[PDB]
Design a protein around this ligand. Sequence first.
Ligand SMILES: OC[C@H]1O[C@H](O[C@H]2[C@H](O)[C@@H](O)[C@@H](O[C@@H]3CO[C@@H](O)[C@H](O)[C@H]3O)O[C@@H]2CO)[C@H](O)[C@@H](O)[C@@H]1O
Ligand SMILES: OC[C@H]1O[C@H](O[C@H]2[C@H](O)[C@@H](O)[C@@H](O[C@@H]3CO[C@@H](O)[C@H](O)[C@H]3O)O[C@@H]2CO)[C@H](O)[C@@H](O)[C@@H]1O
Ligand SMILES: [Ca+2]
Length: 516
Amino acid sequence: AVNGKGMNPDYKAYLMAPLKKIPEVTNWETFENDLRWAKQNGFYAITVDFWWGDMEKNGDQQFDFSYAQRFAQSVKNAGMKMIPIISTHQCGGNVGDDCNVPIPSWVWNQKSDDSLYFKSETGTVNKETLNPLASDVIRKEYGELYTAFAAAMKPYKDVIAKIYLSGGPAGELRYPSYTTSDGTGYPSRGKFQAYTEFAKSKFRLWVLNKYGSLNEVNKAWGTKLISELAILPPSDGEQFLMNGYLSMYGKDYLEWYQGILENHTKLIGELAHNAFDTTFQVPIGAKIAGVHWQYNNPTIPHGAEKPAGYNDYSHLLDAFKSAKLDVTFTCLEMTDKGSYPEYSMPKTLVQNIATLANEKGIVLNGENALSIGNEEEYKRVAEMAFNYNFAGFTLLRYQDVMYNNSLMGKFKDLLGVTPVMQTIVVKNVPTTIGDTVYITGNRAELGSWDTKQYPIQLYYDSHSNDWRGNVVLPAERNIEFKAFIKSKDGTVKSWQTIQQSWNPVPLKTTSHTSSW
Ligand SMILES: OC[C@H]1O[C@H](O[C@H]2[C@H](O)[C@@H](O)[C@@H](O[C@@H]3CO[C@@H](O)[C@H](O)[C@H]3O)O[C@@H]2CO)[C@H](O)[C@@H](O)[C@@H]1O
Ligand SMILES: OC[C@H]1O[C@H](O[C@H]2[C@H](O)[C@@H](O)[C@@H](O[C@@H]3CO[C@@H](O)[C@H](O)[C@H]3O)O[C@@H]2CO)[C@H](O)[C@@H](O)[C@@H]1O
Ligand SMILES: [Ca+2]
């Protein structure tokens, strides 16, 4: 893995449950059988959406956690674990969606103004999640829901491995910038979603707050605004993405815009930790979408990420760390294209995020964006997960592998692995002052023969007089590897003579000794 390390000792694989309730796609008895089968293939837990629209449908505090409790019972019956997602966002509701569970209709009546929803540059209204600007309604409703859910789930704390929160549309911390109704779907540039009167007013007050008066605002922006009402969000999103973002005004508006998401993160994290910590004592996480299109567009750089709220990922990740939430990146199986008209750079994106998350010490989890039907995609996921320190990977979705034994087998082999600590020892290494010894091998866990950034570093044991290291390998998998010397200048000097193997990697910790 990157810099000389191996796969994450805590790596675990999870399977995403279907969108519809179990009794609609199968029955409780078969479901438990499916869970034991998934468990057999390396899956540690089942992640599942518990819809707000289902749990507090009829009215304020009129809760219904019966489904969630019944689901948990079957998970306990199958000897599995579960990761519930408190889904405060809408399910489906489009042409031929596999679900349609809007957030409780009574919630929209809590306000007379337009503070609860989003309005795009072109006036498209979006109501699939509450606008993070309405922090008062969010603090009340989310706090109530999280606390009620914790109480209801208290008896099943033993099968709960982690809890996910929905930070926005599709369960991700972002703005609903890419939708068909707004004409911003892939691979198009997104649209800013801060055009409600409430949003305009907040931006205005935010600006006046940091500068004090319009005279100070005009000094900083180098503008000539006549009145405070002239303080508005981008009138032309395309022009703003082309060059407006570079201005002092552009930096300020983007700071406010992403800032709303950062504050939402800290709010929901605070409410969640208040509600779940004492009782469950499990990790809590949220998701960040993989907005890979328009990434490297020449004229509108990052034209889809910015409207979604992603301007500075480092500053964004800082919010996750302060809120004490683990991060889940939802796009691991794709590769970079970077060509017109999509300008899609999925892999570079993931690499950037992983690097940042790791520098900050944020536990990182991954997920595939679209259903995988080819082994090659599993291979791409393995490279990112095993070389960029991912603590876990969730497979979307259930039915894809549950009803396809072949795909299930390739998953078990490639991704449904159990990390195990082993000691690799190499004797007779002809090293010179400044020579470092590494090992690389066939599987993604060994860097796939890469000698540049993915090799695993060994260390000289002064006592035993040799090179060895505690490497984490996938248990019960056949591996092949060779040690190699890297000169002072970072170039490969030589390779071990005979190629080594471990068929398979032992389930128990031992050592593999070989001569140069
Ligand atoms: O709140 C002030 C002002 O903000 C908005 O106008 C922005 C515009 O969205 C930005 O792209 C940027 O545009 C400038 C305009 O001058 C050109 O010569 C430059 O090439 C662009 O970079 O800045 C302006 C404000 O300075 C909003 O559209 C507007 O209604 C509002 O009054
Ligand atoms: O927020 C949900 C989801 O959005 C993004 O997914 C992208 C995806 O990365 C694109 O390749 C593209 O896929 C479409 C999805 O619809 C199918 O019918 C088409 O066949 C695919 O080509 O668009 C989606 C949606 O914009 C994001 O990448 C992802 O991380 C996130 O979870
Ligand atoms: Ca409530």
